[PDB]
Amino acid sequence: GPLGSKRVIVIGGALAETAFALGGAETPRYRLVGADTTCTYPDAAKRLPKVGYQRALSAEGLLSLRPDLVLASAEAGPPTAIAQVKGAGVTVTTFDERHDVESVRAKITGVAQALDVRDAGAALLQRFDRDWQAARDAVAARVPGGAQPPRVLFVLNHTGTQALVAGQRTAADAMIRYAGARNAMQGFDHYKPLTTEALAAAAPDVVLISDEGLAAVGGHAALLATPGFGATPAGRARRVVSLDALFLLGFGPRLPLAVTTLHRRLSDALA
């Protein structure tokens, strides 16, 4: 349009991945100029000046980068910061997050629409869909452990000796199920502090944690010494899988690889 090339800011790591996956840092139609701190992939994202954590944005910092457009994840906030950006006349297009493959496909087509690169969107979607079918095939070939879907506990983080764990309506729950496994935690949504009682009942076969969470707790031995973890199937077998948080949980264009990778890791762990 008459605005020419647009300066774009992206909030949400998977959105940034989507943008970069359509055709690099700057194209004829747009240039990415800023992001929130969760946008660490690929190297071009990591390079962008950052304007706060995605839930604690600096509206002033963001506006100082003179955006024409902001692509914002469902998690972008707080509301007063978003409102200040819109009030300065900047277009803010917000995406949904449903933690499923269709929701990623909507990010692909939605971001490509917002950036006026329909053809690039369609090409990326076709690649993504081919890769997704392959990932489905890889998972379907063999259940990790070779029997019924194994029980996996996802730890986000710890406060002291207490782990914060994923129930339903989470990225982790969806990823565990895409990889042919079952969430060891059932009966609640979102994240909740894990009680040793809930943990004994959950009886995980594998503990899954992000690289960041593993570092925060002090490593593998530290994690397994968390109260209650030893006396579980995973603890007895010392069965831990780590993956990078953005890659594991982001629900972006690497979803097929992320699911293949989680399934490989769980499969190795349950050899």
Ligand SMILES: [Cl-]
């Ligand atoms: Cl791997």
